[PDB]
Each structure stands twice: as C-alpha cells, then as structure tokens.
Amino acid sequence: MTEQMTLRGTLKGHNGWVTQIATTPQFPDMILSASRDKTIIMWKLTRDETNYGIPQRALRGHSHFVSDVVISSDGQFALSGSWDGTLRLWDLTTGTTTRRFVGHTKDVLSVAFSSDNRQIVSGSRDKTIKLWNTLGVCKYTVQDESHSEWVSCVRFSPNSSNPIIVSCGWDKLVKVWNLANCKLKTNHIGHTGYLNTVTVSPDGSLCASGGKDGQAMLWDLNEGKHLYTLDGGDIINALCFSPNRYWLCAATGPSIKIWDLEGKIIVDELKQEVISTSSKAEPPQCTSLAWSADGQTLFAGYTDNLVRVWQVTIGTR
C-alpha cells in the first residue's frame, strides 16, 4: 500500500505562467495562485466532477508579473510581490489592496510572512533584502553581507524559538540571518548554479535549496551544517516539505520529484500526461508547489497557465 499521487484535475483561468501557489490551514477550500497575467486568482475548491475548482476572485493591482503570494495565519489577508518592485497587502474579503510596500528599485522576487505575521521580508533583483512591518514601513534594509546577485527567495522559519530568515540568490549562496539583529548567521556554499528557491521544514530545523545546478541540498538550521544532496536531474523551480510526512517535493523541469527523506529515495515522480503529438516543444515547466493543510493534496503551477491538483492516494501493491 505504498502512497502514490494521481491527477485529480486542473484549475483553469490564468492567462500567464502560474508563478506561485498559496494555501491556508484555515480555509481548506480556498487557494491563491499568482501568475504572469499580473493578477492573483482566489479559487473556490468545489471538488465537483466538472471542475475541481473555479476562479472566485481576482486581485488586480500589479502592473507586472506577480512573483510571490502568501496567505496570513488568520487567512484573511494575502501579501504579494511583483516585477513592478512593490508589495501589496490584499484583503481577501473584498479583493482590494489594503497597503502598498515601496522601496525596492528592481523586481521583487520573493515575499514571506513571519510566523506571527508581525514582520514581512522581501527579496528583489536589486540584490537586497528588506524587512517591513504591516504598515508598509521598511524597518530595515540588509545591504551588508547580502547576496551579490539577485535575491530569488526569502523565507521565515516556522520555529519561533529560532527566529531566522533563510535567503538564496543567484550568487549560488544560502544565507541564514538572525532576525533579532538582522545580521548574517551562516553562509552555506556548495551550489554550482544560481539558486531559485529555499524551503524550511514545518519544525524550522531543515532547509532545502535548489536551482540551476539541479541539486537539492539539505542544510541543518539548528547546527548550520550540510546534510544531504538529492539529484533532481533538472532545474529546480520550487521546493516544498510535506506538512505531515518526511517528504521533499521539487518542481524539477516539467515533472515533480518527491523524496522520502528517511530513505533518500524517490517516492513518486509526477509527470504530466504527455500527448502523443508530433510537436517537439518542451513540455510545460512546473514552477510552483504547495501542500494543502492536511497534506493530502499538492497544487502545482506550470507555464501553460494551469494549476494541476495531485492527490495522495494509497496505492495498493
């Protein structure tokens, strides 16, 4: 009865690459997905035979590609970043921009919400990390010891006891910052390509990074030491930890590889149903991943404007 994943359905409605997917534990029937169509679609998970989900609302305030989107712990707000250089705080009840965050001079590539939602962190192509409050005021700007190339991903650690921020960039470095003084804490070297994503486990003890070099390295956040490297075999566009199982999911090229962290083995490889077409074009690239609240559903965004839904089905041998 090894666990397997099956395609339950796709979410249609986006007009550009689905860049990020966000889920909230409070609302199992609602997810958000950013896109290159400059909008964020709030979905209604009807789970009907005709459609798994339909678009319910669109957040239309960004003038360029939306890069990142995160939902609040309460689930009523959504922070978002864009290539317009600004962040937007959305009230999900009315779909309006409550607040705007200005100060980045280049495209914003990643935004994160603190565990207690009282802090906001963003990375931008201007090579800097900015820390904001909920009122739109940039309290601190990290330029000393910052990445020398684009900051592609910034994340918070879910563990409040360890207040750290993980940051990757195109300078092939993973940096851990102490949130107490906004100072560099650890500097992880070992990637031979630019980094695209970093994810932190639900217990705030392990970090996974990946990107151009195709290797998903795991770094201990408690001890600041390299642990293992998993061969993705393709450019890693997104990384995710299962909220309940010891799994690491990577959006490597057009497919998603799931790894059992205990055995360092591939549990499943989620390839799209490639039609027997004569087209020589590369299949759509998986660029985003998100696990549901209960960890039984995985949402993946692709470059064909779709959000494919994968279900954890107990597969009898």
Partner: peptide, 11 residues
Amino acid sequence: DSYAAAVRRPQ
C-alpha cells in the same frame, strides 16, 4: 523527531 533527524537516520 525532527526533519533534520530524519535525514540523519541512515538508510
């Protein structure tokens, strides 16, 4: 245990 501990466990 922790996620780091799971990786640390030998296969």
